[PDB]
């Protein structure tokens, strides 16, 4: 039954990412004055399916072992990185899972650098080196902010987190920390306004958008949600899914609106605006439970 659990996880990742692409394209269309796409079939579903098919039948051409090894790592992260996400009963009860999130984000940085090395000595690989540098400049911020938002939760176990979110949401004790972390999720997804940047393009594209859905599900679990009532977990599943959907639409909706940074403005902004503010909010979150006598039950 355990391989059946694995198949019920990683068969809807294909449908999830493909229908995510139609959802984001339709949503951008209605953000503008566009009905795109609706002509190709009933409300545009066979258009992403058959378009994925056409992308698989492109017949491209060509170091070969490196070109093999990069997108296989990207998509095996995209598969193996929905394991401890506690849609009510998670797949593996990891004692620590958030540090596993950080480690596999670093593996995504490996993937980008291997693709840039496989790109065979190009001004594109210099740009991809810069993209590796900007992507690696974010796991400091994400780990430190994640450390502070678990500090009010005691353990790394994330079931304790779903215990903590019953009374009020955790968005209220840490809202600006959450704001900086959500900007870091925009940062880690390598999309707008944080840009730029051959095949197999379907597998690489799949890796990026499964990484997006992972970051949005983890955002939804980390800060808000509903209550885990046993012997009817589907209620929590539905409410969690609705909130994660609204957050992902908001995520693409913020992508729909602003021009993208300058690279040096991005570094300048990152260090000289997030990084002291992270440290200051984090030391305040350290000294907070000793001044409220509320340290969480680290069991």
């Amino acid at each position: 039954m355990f391989m059946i659990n694995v198949l019920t996880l990683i068969i809807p990742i294909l449908l999830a990412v493909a229908f995510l692409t139609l959802v984001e394209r339709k949503v951008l269309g209605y953000m503008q004055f566009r009905k795109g796409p609706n002509v190709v079939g009933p409300y545009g579903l066979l258009q992403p399916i058959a378009d994925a098919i056409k992308l698989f039948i492109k017949e491209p051409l060509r170091s070969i072992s490196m070109f093999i090894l990069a997108p296989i790592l990207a998509l095996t992260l995209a598969l193996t990185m929905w394991i401890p996400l506690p849609m009510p009963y998670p797949l593996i009860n990891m004692n620590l899972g958030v540090l596993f999130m950080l480690a596999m984000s670093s593996l995504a940085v490996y993937s980008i650098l291997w693709s840039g090395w496989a790109s065979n000595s190009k001004y594109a690989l210099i740009g991809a080196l810069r993209a590796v540098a900007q992507t690696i400049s974010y796991e400091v911020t994400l780990a430190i902010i994640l450390l502070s938002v678990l500090l009010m939760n005691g353990s790394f176990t994330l079931s304790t987190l779903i215990i903590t979110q019953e009374q009020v949401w955790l968005i209220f004790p840490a809202w600006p920390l959450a704001m900086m972390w959500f900007i870091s999720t925009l940062a880690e997804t390598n999309r707008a306004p944080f840009d730029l940047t051959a095949g197999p393009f379907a597998l690489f594209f799949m890796a990026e958008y499964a990484n997006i859905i992972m970051m949005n599900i983890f955002t939804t679990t980390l800060f808000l949600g509903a209550f885990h009532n046993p012997y009817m977990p589907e209620l929590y599943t539905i409410n969690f899914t609705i909130k994660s959907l609204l957050l992902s639409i908001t995520f693409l909706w913020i992508r729909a609106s602003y021009p993208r940074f300058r690279y040096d403005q991005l570094m300048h902004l990152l260090w000289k605006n997030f990084l002291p503010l992270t440290l200051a909010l984090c030391m305040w979150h350290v000294s907070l439970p000793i001044l409220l006598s509320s340290i969480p039950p680290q069991t």
């Binding site: 698989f56 039948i57 394991i83 197999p200 440290l279 350290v286 000793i290 680290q298």
Partner: protein, 97 residues
């Protein structure tokens, strides 16, 4: 070993996706035809802040002990030293463009 089974299934299915991406089209039709310094400062900067993150991050497991004063003292000392390193490169105009 359950997670090893998951890793094995995901790795094998992803390799089958890559081989569907490559060795599928049977229609074999027609075969045809300097670096900078400021890139390097960012990596070592990340590296040293990551090391001090590794020093910081076992903080919440430690939160259940008696010596609270020394804990709060050395914790504030660690974040203060990290911010002092940041302010040192900030005031010595290091990471600038």
């Amino acid at each position: 070993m359950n997670l090893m089974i998951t890793l094995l299934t995901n790795f094998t299915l992803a390799t089958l996706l890559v081989t569907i991406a490559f060795w599928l089209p049977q229609l074999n039709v027609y075969s045809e035809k300097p670096f900078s310094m400021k890139f390097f400062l960012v990596a070592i900067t990340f590296l040293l802040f990551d090391l001090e993150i590794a020093l910081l991050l076992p903080l919440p497991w430690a939160s259940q002990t008696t010596n609270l004063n020394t804990m709060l003292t050395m914790a504030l000392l660690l974040i203060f030293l990290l911010a002092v390193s940041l302010a040192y490169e900030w005031t010595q105009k290091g990471l600038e463009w």
